[PDB]
């Protein structure tokens, strides 16, 4: 059956769509690419990666960055509305995106290749609140990797927030002062972040506060052999603790 673009289906809603639109309206990709550096691209190049699957395309930032770097990218997302934005953003940068609508829990339904690398970036994995769904998603990613493939999966540093550290009592800024991100409510099973933009817009979003070692455990448990977790400093006013972690999980 064909996929229809809807502002409200099972994979996105108008609120989250408004949030990503607001981020993209105020934060240009050039600035974001400079602030994030070439860590992702360099990891892939040092591994000889050619074919990449983006499982969390969103409005397309990671996919377009990888296309610009010369990778063969397939751009998947659960949301058809997101994929339309991502395709047109790629078009605006002079690239033809290969979009596929797919749910992490059945990734090979319409994707039949295997990939040198998968990227699941922008703190996307934390959207899953059910442990069974987490294992299912990581198992689906594992199965889509070639024998010597690698999964790049990032997350916010929830350990520092759950342990009542400095980062739990303070907002974190991105793209200068364009947006602040504040952990309004934190418990073992839920973090609600307040995102306040420079134009006065406020969005409140829920995430599952994955501890760094719990994510590593899940990756090991679905079959990944070696995992290296890197501190990833993205925020404007850097602290002793990174605001993100990047897991580099090798299939074999
Ligand atoms: N279960 C699921 N299956 C497929 N896609 C999912 C999903 N849960 C969340 N997503 C997607 O994950 C994306 C997170 S947004 C992050 C987008 C991009 N990596 C960036 O950093 O800008 C959303 O577009 C959302 O639709």
Residue numbers in the entry: 12 to 263
Task: List sentences from the manuscript.
Betaine biosynthesis is accomplished by three N-methylation steps in which glycine is sequentially converted to sarcosine, dimethylglycine and the final product betaine. Two dual-activity, SAM-dependent methyltransferases sharing an overlapping function are employed to carry out this three-step biosynthetic pathway as follows: MpGSMT adds the first and second methyl groups to glycine, and the sarcosine dimethylglycine N-methyltransferase (MpSDMT) catalyzes the second and third methylation events. Similar to other commonly exploited regulatory strategies, the control of betaine production is achieved by betaine-mediated feedback inhibition of MpGSMT, the first enzyme in the betaine biosynthetic pathway. Consistent with previous sequence-based prediction, our structural analysis validated that MpGSMT indeed belongs to the Class I methyltransferases, with a characteristic seven-stranded Rossmann-like α/β catalytic core responsible for substrate and cofactor binding.
To further test whether the functional switching of MpGSMT from the inactivated into active state requires a helix-to-loop transition of the H1 helix of the N-terminal region, we examined whether reducing the stability of the H1 helix could enhance MpGSMT activity by lowering the threshold of the conformational change. Four residues in the H1 helix (His21, Glu23, Glu24, Lys28) show a high propensity for helix formation and are not directly located in the active site. These residues were mutated to amino acids with considerably lower helical propensity (Gly, Thr, Asn and Ser, respectively) to give a tetramutated MpGSMT (MpGSMT4mut). It should be noted that none of the four mutation sites are conserved and all four were replaced by residues found in other members of the GSMT family or conserved in the GNMT family. Indeed, MpGSMT4mut was abundantly expressed and purified to homogeneity, and the crystal structure of MpGSMT4mut was essentially identical to the wild-type enzyme, except that the N-terminus of H1 helix prior to residue Glu25 underwent a helix-to-loop transition. Consistent with our assumption, the introduction of helix-destabilizing mutations increased the activity by 2.36-fold compared to wild-type MpGSMT, suggesting that the presence of the H1 helix may be indicative of the catalytically inactivated enzyme and that enzyme activation can be triggered by a conformational change involving the disruption of this helix.
